[PDB]
Ligand binder design. Structure first.
Ligand SMILES: *[C@@H]1O[C@H](CO)[C@@H](O[C@@H]2O[C@H](CO)[C@@H](O[C@@H]3O[C@H](CO[C@H]4O[C@H](CO)[C@@H](O)[C@H](O)[C@@H]4O)[C@@H](O)[C@H](O[C@H]4O[C@H](CO)[C@@H](O)[C@H](O)[C@@H]4O)[C@@H]3O)[C@H](O)[C@H]2NC(C)=O)[C@H](O)[C@H]1NC(C)=O
Ligand SMILES: *[C@@H]1O[C@H](CO)[C@@H](O[C@@H]2O[C@H](CO)[C@@H](O[C@@H]3O[C@H](CO[C@H]4O[C@H](CO)[C@@H](O)[C@H](O)[C@@H]4O)[C@@H](O)[C@H](O)[C@@H]3O)[C@H](O)[C@H]2NC(C)=O)[C@H](O)[C@H]1NC(C)=O
Ligand SMILES: *[C@@H]1O[C@H](CO)[C@@H](O[C@@H]2O[C@H](CO)[C@@H](O[C@@H]3O[C@H](CO)[C@@H](O)[C@H](O)[C@@H]3O)[C@H](O)[C@H]2NC(C)=O)[C@H](O)[C@H]1NC(C)=O
Ligand SMILES: *[C@@H]1O[C@H](CO)[C@@H](O[C@@H]2O[C@H](CO)[C@@H](O[C@@H]3O[C@H](CO)[C@@H](O)[C@H](O)[C@@H]3O)[C@H](O)[C@H]2NC(C)=O)[C@H](O)[C@H]1NC(C)=O
Ligand SMILES: *[C@@H]1O[C@H](CO)[C@@H](O[C@@H]2O[C@H](CO)[C@@H](O[C@@H]3O[C@H](CO)[C@@H](O)[C@H](O)[C@@H]3O)[C@H](O)[C@H]2NC(C)=O)[C@H](O)[C@H]1NC(C)=O
Ligand SMILES: *[C@@H]1O[C@H](CO[C@@H]2O[C@@H](C)[C@@H](O)[C@@H](O)[C@@H]2O)[C@@H](O[C@@H]2O[C@H](CO)[C@@H](O)[C@H](O)[C@H]2NC(C)=O)[C@H](O)[C@H]1NC(C)=O
Ligand SMILES: *[C@@H]1O[C@H](CO)[C@@H](O[C@@H]2O[C@H](CO)[C@@H](O)[C@H](O)[C@H]2NC(C)=O)[C@H](O)[C@H]1NC(C)=O
Ligand SMILES: *[C@@H]1O[C@H](CO)[C@@H](O[C@@H]2O[C@H](CO)[C@@H](O)[C@H](O)[C@H]2NC(C)=O)[C@H](O)[C@H]1NC(C)=O
Ligand SMILES: *[C@@H]1O[C@H](CO)[C@@H](O[C@@H]2O[C@H](CO)[C@@H](O)[C@H](O)[C@H]2NC(C)=O)[C@H](O)[C@H]1NC(C)=O
Ligand SMILES: *[C@@H]1O[C@H](CO)[C@@H](O[C@@H]2O[C@H](CO)[C@@H](O)[C@H](O)[C@H]2NC(C)=O)[C@H](O)[C@H]1NC(C)=O
Ligand SMILES: *[C@@H]1O[C@H](CO)[C@@H](O)[C@H](O)[C@H]1NC(C)=O
Ligand SMILES: *[C@@H]1O[C@H](CO)[C@@H](O)[C@H](O)[C@H]1NC(C)=O
Ligand SMILES: *[C@@H]1O[C@H](CO)[C@@H](O)[C@H](O)[C@H]1NC(C)=O
Ligand SMILES: *[C@@H]1O[C@H](CO)[C@@H](O)[C@H](O)[C@H]1NC(C)=O
Ligand SMILES: *[C@@H]1O[C@H](CO)[C@@H](O)[C@H](O)[C@H]1NC(C)=O
Ligand SMILES: *[C@@H]1O[C@H](CO)[C@@H](O)[C@H](O)[C@H]1NC(C)=O
Lengths: 1038, 177, 50, 50, 50
């Protein structure tokens, strides 16, 4: 009876929506894969009646053997009240009928073994008893066999079926295959299902799975068909794929979620037990009051658990109104009156809001809206006293009815008619007092039900007379909230190391947050520290590498599920899991937090798949003489094409406010124009954006006052750049690398989708390419002059010879090694095409920028789906739903939320545009200062220095293929600051006197071309009498 | 909050990139040389003194003490994250860049840390503002003396004055508030 | 959040300026006169700050 | 067969299928675009353009 | 922009005067409190915008 496993199977279709080579993650009922399943037995005599609940759906699959299983009973509970889905199955077909099911023990069918010729299997047939509600009655359509598979979901009765017809080649358990399960029919029925019961045809009396609100990331095909499916949290690489929406993820930490932990919830605490609440002497008093003379005494500044008097075992009646008497202590009140007096026993009923009697008539009135509890308590063996307990009187005469809780004690000469008494009573002069008269042998009606009234007087006065709610043992060192009489917060409540004062009850920090609390029940002190918080961003590589993740926790004290099936190396960033520690700190790959980078590794020696981390150290410290002597100057150099990329513009999304909002709706436009101005200011601000980056595009591209055509005579002399010059043989006049880039960059994709009014660029593809061509032609062949007014041609053999000296290098090294320079220039171009064909890392940020453009448009459109109290993306349905007056009063706040959504969106648009203008003036800086010339200022035009950059086409962007001089050797040798000959120092303004020790020579500050000391290069200036570490040398004249 | 989570991730990327091209431009995480032979260029207040196990210096402590009132810096929604480069090794970066300009001079960024002597590195420094390095060779010991005095006056403006602390205090306090 | 993003914009512009200071002003000397502080600029010593 | 609706990369209405017949359709917003009027200065006469 | 800052007072959201004090005086002090609640929320919108 062992259990089994499932790999990936059981994926359905969301709805009839048709997609095309896209990646959606729409959330609905889902099937967790790698989830526990069961392998049953087939007849070879067990009943095989797997009857489970339909919790969130059921995953099913089977292989038929002899057309055995056909009986299903899908229902809620089957108490002869809920429906059931009868099923029939011929050879390769389906059919569903739904109505009732009433059978006991084992419902099933039976195919006999020793059948002489045939059989029919309908004798037992515990299938139907009274098919009296069959609405959705829809009828239509030797080794191992094929496979069947059914999945469903519970959406308002939509028991939608999904089926597939293909065989499998696994006879033991689930196949090692993967496929979708397309919907066949969605019956509506109308009675839900939570319990599914099945029956089958066996002589004597099939996987089962379960669904949950899981998550998925689908990947369809160009035929619009499901290919695979992945959850998110099941293996955190899947979380990475979900948050990045791709099945081929590069390695990196991707924020997953937080974790709102709350161990042992929170502790509720009130001060120590009441003080100056002697309820006994008021309620078990020898001295009570009369009904018309009811006493009135307060209880204050001491708490009352209204349940301790309940369990004090001293009453016979417990009636409380308004608020819950049970555990009423947790509620805190202004003040309470606890009064005791005596009335007739039968009158407990009469003691309530609105009840009547002689008590209410002349003795004691109760408010209709009473705010209190009422209790009566019996002492029947003590309610009478020898000599009779008639001490407490009651009133028989009163002209006026009492006001709420009014007390009448006056016993003046009572007058009833208009004939007076003159102070002496008698006939028509009625005595107003009579006594109770409690006798030991009196009947139950006069046998007292002695009542006590508890009134909670909740005026505007402060509520501090309260009840002890739940004062329990202090929770030490368990992250919990607290309830100190009204204040809460996740606290590390333990003994705290500070001094406290009588004024101290609650405390804040400089940031006004609870950092210390105080024990109200006794002299004890507590502190609070933020216990866990922290989000999760998983450090795992992508689907190309293994699926073994590593998970990091952000600044949270190791108090949540240590390493297990659910290692640990604690860091300043928090508790790290899923990655064992490594002593050595490699070169970083992916920072996670507190400067730790983790790379998956395999320690071949058995095969373990675990990720390893380390700390921040690019190699180690470099050990060279740093005090006074060692000087390092490269005898060799390289030219790496530092392909940095700058976003020159942005999609000119000149949104049309009204038409973006109010499409085919005059009511919407009418209501918007009441707000009016706003969206118009948004509109022309966006147009100002458009003109801003179009001017950027101009001055970065049409900085020349003239359109220029590249010369068709490619005599550049062995240095060529044909992959960057537009070859005159293509329909789009962009060169090779533009082709590769534009193939690499994709995804908005057109100007004709929606209210997303994509304006065409002020420079379209062919003519933005024309500008790029013009720029490259100039900066290669005429240069600054054609970029700064009148053209003057210049060969590239001089265009860069100038700019070595523009950096510090000398054009002599060009003349001496330029054939190689060109060869490695072509090598750099090859590196371009290679590392930019499919490798997106180098070409990253331009594509990235057009991304946040794309999902900016995407949040702009699906912001409509963010219905701000609406029931749709666009109110068009709601627009037609209500009367234009009612439409006015609803679209008012609804489309007001929509326009503030627009304002938000365009605000991120403004900010994005702001950093784009920053980057765009930066692009102008690059182009003008560095390509129409050269930024002599060090290392600003990409890593290393800068010689050329070649403007190559990019949607709203550009790449500047810097030709940077980069050192390659460490001649880290002894030094000489100057040449003390006879008290004077020989030195050029640039250069350093350098030697390994053989010959002290002068050489340039970035290239090791040593030279003889000469009076021309080395010219005497000042003296050398103040130096730190000089050595002498001779001087010669060539 | 989806887009704002994106925005805060953008904030993280911008800040640690700021760190990168401000600190982690180094191609080799780096530490100070053992000996200190410079020519009067006392760096105790600035360079991480190997005396303290932590690699900070006097002005680091002065900065910390002057702006201890960092308020948050945590409790309620204050989901502050520690720097992707910790304080101790961001100080290691401070040292790295320090010794880098000390030794590999301005050539540092061009690749390998091609070290050059600091004292004669100032020669390129004087030549970097149009004054010939002869003045270095003619008065540089004194140059160092009043340079050290200038650093001491900086420390004075750090401790007995808040002029050197002004807009740091403003930015941290405005973040705090 | 918008205020924080905007402040991020200005501070990050200042931060690119900081990188430029690192480059033309620490990893190099700004031939561009008198922006690295009053007077001229030779070089600078970076140091930590919160 | 199970499909009836349509979508596109930007998750907006791209194609629909006729419930009464099988036909591979497309939908595109009508014209939009814009109206930017070109004209010389009004010191020059009223020869207009759209 | 200054003229805007002035003229969204015309953008009166459901009121019919520039400065809202007369609308406040136009309704009963509780009812005026209710209406001025959302006039002032709109005014805060205008503030944060500007
Ligand atoms: C909805 O359901 C109704 C049910 O009747 C369909 O009506 C029939 O539809 C079929 C095909 O859909 C019609 O067949 C027609 O064939 C014509 C070709 O003519 C040759 O073949 C006939 C076959 O009998 C010969 O008799 C004749 O001499 C010719 O040799 C086509 O020209 C017809 O096309 C028309 O209908 C289709 C839609 O079906 C339109 O798209 C066309 O533009 C054109 O208008 C048609 O294919 C049959 O005649 C119909 N009979 C009746 C009684 O209606 C509807 O067609 C169906 N809806 C759709 C969209 O198919
Ligand atoms: C997406 O939907 C498209 C629309 O149908 C699919 O296009 C179909 O593609 C198939 C093959 O790719 C074409 O099949 C034709 O079959 C005939 C005869 O079949 C013989 O040859 C095959 C081997 O190809 C053999 O296995 C058979 O047993 C037969 O002996 C061939 O002569 C044709 O060359 C062609 O292969 C369909 O015609 C074509 N549908 C059309 C044109 O309407 C496409 O395949 C779908 N996508 C995927 C991934 O399947
Ligand atoms: C309210 O809460 C409790 C209730 O008594 C008080 O703390 C408890 O009492 C005293 C301290 O007040 C602790 O010492 C104990 O005293 C008793 C009585 O003398 C003695 O018999 C014991 O041997 C012990 O010494 C007692 O331990 C403590 N309870 C616990 C669990 O530690 C508290 O002081 C009260 N505060 C007020 C303001 O009433
Ligand atoms: C030029 O630079 C290289 C590295 O950039 C220098 O190599 C390094 O030299 C130092 C000492 O000169 C080495 O430190 C010592 O190395 C010995 C043996 O290698 C070891 O036994 C000591 O414990 C100490 O570590 C260092 O290892 C070595 N390699 C590095 C730093 O990667 C080279 O010496 C420099 N050239 C000159 C002329 O100094
Ligand atoms: C560069 O700067 C440091 C900064 O601390 C300087 O440290 C100085 O070191 C000297 C001795 O090494 C200290 O001199 C003192 O002399 C008295 C005379 O009796 C003696 O009792 C003291 O114990 C101490 O030796 C001097 O106070 C100290 N200065 C400071 C500000 O701490 C030093 O000039 C240089 N350090 C180097 C090059 O390592
Ligand atoms: C569906 O049909 C049922 C009829 O079956 C009844 O309920 C079974 C549990 C069993 O007791 C049969 O013998 C019954 O005949 C409808 O059930 C009754 O419907 C009437 C009104 O139509 C209602 O007054 C009764 O309370 C229902 N229950 C019973 C036990 O009589 C049921 O209404 C039909 N519709 C739905 C949606 O279930
Ligand atoms: C095959 O499936 C269909 C429903 O999906 C059913 O077919 C019925 O078969 C019987 C017996 O041959 C016929 O009398 C009926 O006329 C068929 N139905 C229809 C609508 O024509 C049945 O469930 C399956 N066939 C069998 C034999 O069980
Ligand atoms: C839908 O499923 C529920 C789950 O039991 C069925 O039960 C009743 O559900 C309604 C509202 O969902 C409750 O008010 C009742 O108290 C539930 N009754 C019981 C006994 O639990 C419900 O009957 C199902 N729907 C239909 C139409 O039958
Ligand atoms: C500078 O280094 C480059 C390689 O980085 C050298 O180019 C090689 O030179 C040798 C002989 O000079 C040739 O045999 C190789 O074919 C060259 N290319 C390589 C190795 O890829 C260059 O020579 C060096 N500079 C000097 C002056 O020698
Ligand atoms: C200029 O660069 C181009 C690069 O496109 C070189 O063109 C190659 O020429 C060879 C032989 O004629 C062809 O096999 C290649 O297909 C061409 N294209 C390539 C490699 O992309 C051309 O050789 C270069 N010219 C000089 C003088 O070096
Ligand atoms: C899954 O199956 C294994 C087989 O032993 C079993 O141990 C485990 O408890 C099952 N898990 C659940 C809860 O389904
Ligand atoms: C977590 O907090 C407890 C509080 O007592 C402390 O003892 C423990 O060392 C802390 N662990 C870490 C490293 O967070
Ligand atoms: C870890 O690496 C350091 C590096 O110096 C070394 O000193 C130490 O011995 C190593 N320890 C282990 C356990 O590998
Ligand atoms: C040492 O100096 C000699 C000069 O004779 C030079 O050729 C050699 O390259 C130097 N050593 C190194 C490692 O460069
Ligand atoms: C550099 O300093 C070391 C140690 O102080 C010394 O041995 C060496 O001679 C010095 N060299 C120069 C040129 O000052
Ligand atoms: C309008 O003004 C422009 C401004 O220079 C001038 O060139 C043009 O000739 C004027 N035309 C008329 C008709 O006034």
């Amino acid at each position: 009876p062992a259990y089994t496993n499932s790999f990936t199977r059981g994926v359905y279709y969301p709805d009839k929506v048709f997609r095309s080579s896209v990646l959606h993650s729409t959330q609905d009922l889902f099937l967790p894969f790698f989830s526990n399943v069961t392998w049953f037995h087939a007849i070879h005599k067990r009943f095989d009646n797997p009857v489970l609940p339909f919790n969130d759906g059921v995953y099913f699959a089977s292989t038929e053997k002899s057309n055995i299983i056909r009986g299903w009973i899908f229902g809620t509970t089957l108490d002869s009240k809920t429906q059931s889905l009868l099923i029939v199955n011929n050879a390769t077909n389906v059919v569903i009928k739904v109505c009732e099911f009433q059978f006991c023990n084992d419902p099933f069918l039976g195919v006999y073994y020793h059948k002489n010729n045939k059989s029919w299997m309908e004798s037992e047939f515990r299938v139907y008893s009274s098919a009296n509600n069959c609405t959705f009655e829809y009828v239509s359509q030797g080794n191992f066999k094929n496979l069947r598979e059914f999945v469903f979901k519970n959406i308002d009765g939509y028991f939608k079926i999904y089926s597939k017809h293909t065989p499998i080649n696994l006879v033991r358990d689930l196949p090692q295959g993967f496929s979708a399960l397309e919907p066949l029919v969605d019956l509506p029925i109308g009675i839900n299902i939570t319990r599914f019961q099945t029956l089958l045809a066996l002589h004597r009396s099939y996987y089962v799975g379960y669904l949950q609100p899981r998550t998925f990331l689908l990947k369809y095909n160009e035929n619009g068909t499901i290919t695979d499916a992945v959850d998110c949290a099941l293996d955190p690489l899947s979380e990475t794929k979900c948050t990045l929406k791709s099945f081929t993820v590069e390695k990196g930490i991707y924020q997953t979620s937080n974790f709102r932990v709350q161990p042992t919830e929170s502790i509720v605490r009130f001060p120590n037990i009441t003080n100056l609440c002697p309820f006994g002497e008021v309620f078990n008093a020898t001295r009570f009051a009369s009904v018309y003379a009811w006493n009135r005494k307060r209880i204050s500044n001491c708490v009352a658990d209204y349940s301790v008097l309940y369990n004090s075992a001293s009453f016979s009646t417990f009636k409380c109104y308004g608020v819950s008497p049970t555990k009423l202590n947790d509620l805190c009140f202004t003040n309470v009156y606890a009064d005791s007096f005596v009335i007739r026993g039968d009158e407990v009923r009469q003691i309530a809001p609105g009840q009547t009697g002689k008590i209410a008539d002349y003795n004691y009135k109760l408010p209709d809206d009473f705010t209190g509890c009422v209790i009566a308590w019996n002492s029947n063996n003590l309610d009478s006293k020898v000599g009779g307990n008639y001490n407490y009187l009651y009133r028989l005469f009163r002209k006026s009815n009492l006001k709420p809780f009014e007390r009448d004690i006056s016993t003046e000469i009572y007058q009833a008619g208009s004939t007076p008494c003159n102070g002496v009573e008698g006939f028509n002069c009625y005595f107003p007092l009579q006594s109770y008269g409690f006798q030991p042998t009196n009947g139950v009606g006069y046998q007292p039900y002695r009542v006590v009234v508890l009134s909670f007087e909740l005026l505007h006065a402060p509520a501090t007379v309260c009840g002890p709610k739940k004062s329990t043992n202090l929770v030490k060192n368990k992250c919990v909230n607290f309830n100190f009489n009204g204040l809460t917060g996740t606290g590390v409540l333990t003994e705290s190391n500070k001094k406290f004062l009588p004024f101290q009850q609650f405390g804040r920090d400089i940031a006004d947050t609870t950092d210390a609390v105080r024990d109200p029940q006794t002299l004890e002190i507590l502190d609070i520290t933020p216990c866990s918080f922290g989000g999760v961003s998983v450090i795992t590589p992508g689907t190309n590498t293994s699926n073994q993740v590593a998970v990091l926790y952000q600044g949270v004290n190791c108090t949540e599920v240590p390493v297990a099936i659910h290692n640990v190396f604690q860091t300043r960033a928090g508790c790290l899991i899923g990655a064992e520690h490594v002593n050595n700190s490699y070169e970083c790959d992916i920072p996670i937090g507190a400067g730790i980078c983790a790379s998956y590794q395999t320690q071949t020696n058995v095969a373990s798949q675990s990720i390893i981390a380390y700390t921040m150290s690019l190699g180690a410290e470099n050990s060279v003489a740093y005090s006074n002597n060692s000087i390092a100057i490269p005898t060799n150099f390289t030219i790496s094409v530092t392909t940095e990329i700058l976003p020159v513009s942005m999609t000119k999304t000149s949104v049309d406010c009204t038409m973006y909002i109010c499409g085919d709706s005059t009511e919407c436009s009418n209501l918007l124009l009441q707000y009016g101005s706003f969206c118009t200011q948004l509109n022309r601000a966006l147009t100002g954006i458009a003109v801003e980056q179009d001017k950027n595009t101009q001055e970065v591209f049409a900085q020349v006052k003239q359109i220029y055509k590249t010369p068709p005579i490619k005599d550049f002399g062995g240095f060529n750049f044909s992959q960057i010059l537009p070859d005159p043989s293509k329909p789009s006049k962009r060169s090779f690398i533009e082709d590769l880039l534009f193939n690499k960059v994709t995804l908005i994709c057109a100007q004709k989708f929606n209210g997303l009014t994509v304006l065409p660029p002020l420079l379209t593809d062919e003519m933005i390419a024309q500008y790029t061509s013009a720029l490259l032609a100039g900066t290669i062949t005429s240069g600054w002059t054609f970029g700064a007014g009148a053209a003057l041609q210049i060969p590239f053999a001089m265009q860069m010879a100038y700019r070595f000296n523009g950096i510090g290098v000398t054009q002599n090294v060009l003349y001496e090694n330029q054939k190689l320079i060109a060869n490695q220039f072509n090598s750099a171009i090859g590196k371009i095409q290679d590392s930019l064909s499919s490798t997106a890392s180098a070409l990253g940020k331009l594509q990235d920028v057009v991304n946040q453009n794309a999902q900016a448009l995407n949040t702009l459109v699906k912001q409509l789906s963010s219905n701000f109290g609406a029931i749709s993306s666009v109110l068009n349905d709601i627009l037609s739903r209500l009367d234009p007056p009612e439409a006015e009063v609803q679209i008012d706040r609804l489309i007001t939320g929509r326009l503030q959504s627009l304002q938000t969106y365009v605000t991120q648009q403004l900010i994005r545009a702001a950093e784009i203008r920053a980057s765009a003036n930066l692009a102008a800086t690059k182009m003008s200062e560095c390509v129409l010339g050269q930024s002599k200022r060090v290392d600003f035009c990409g890593k290393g220095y800068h010689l050329m950059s070649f403007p190559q086409s990019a949607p709203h962007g550009v790449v500047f293929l810097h030709v940077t001089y980069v050192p390659a050797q460490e001649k880290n040798f002894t030094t000489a600051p100057a040449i003390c000959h006879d008290g004077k120092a020989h030195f050029p303004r640039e250069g350093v006197f350098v030697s390994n020790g053989t010959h002290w020579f002068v050489t340039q500050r970035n290239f090791y071309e040593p030279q003889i000391i000469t009076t021309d290069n080395t010219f005497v200036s000042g003296n050398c009498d103040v130096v730190i570490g000089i050595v002498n040398n001779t001087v010669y004249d060539p | 909050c989806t887009q704002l989570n994106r925005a805060l991730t953008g904030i993280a990327v911008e800040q640690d990139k700021n760190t990168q091209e401000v600190f982690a431009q180094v191609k080799q995480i780096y530490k100070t040389p053992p000996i200190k032979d410079f020519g009067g260029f006392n760096f105790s207040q600035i360079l991480p003194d190997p005396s303290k196990p932590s690699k900070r210096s006097f002005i680091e402590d002065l900065l910390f003490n002057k702006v201890t009132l960092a308020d948050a810096g945590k409790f309620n929604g204050l989901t502050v994250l520690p720097p992707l480069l910790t304080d101790e090794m961001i100080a290691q970066y401070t040292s790295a860049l320090l010794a880098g300009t000390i030794t590999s001079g301005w050539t540092f960024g061009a690749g390998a840390a091609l070290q050059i002597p600091f004292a004669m590195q100032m020669a390129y420094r004087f030549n970097g503002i149009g004054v010939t390095q002869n003045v270095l060779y003619e008065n540089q010991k004194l140059i160092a003396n009043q340079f050290n005095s200038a650093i001491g006056k900086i420390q004075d403006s750090l401790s007995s004055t808040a002029s050197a602390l002004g807009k740091l205090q403003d930015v941290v306090n405005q973040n705090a508030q």
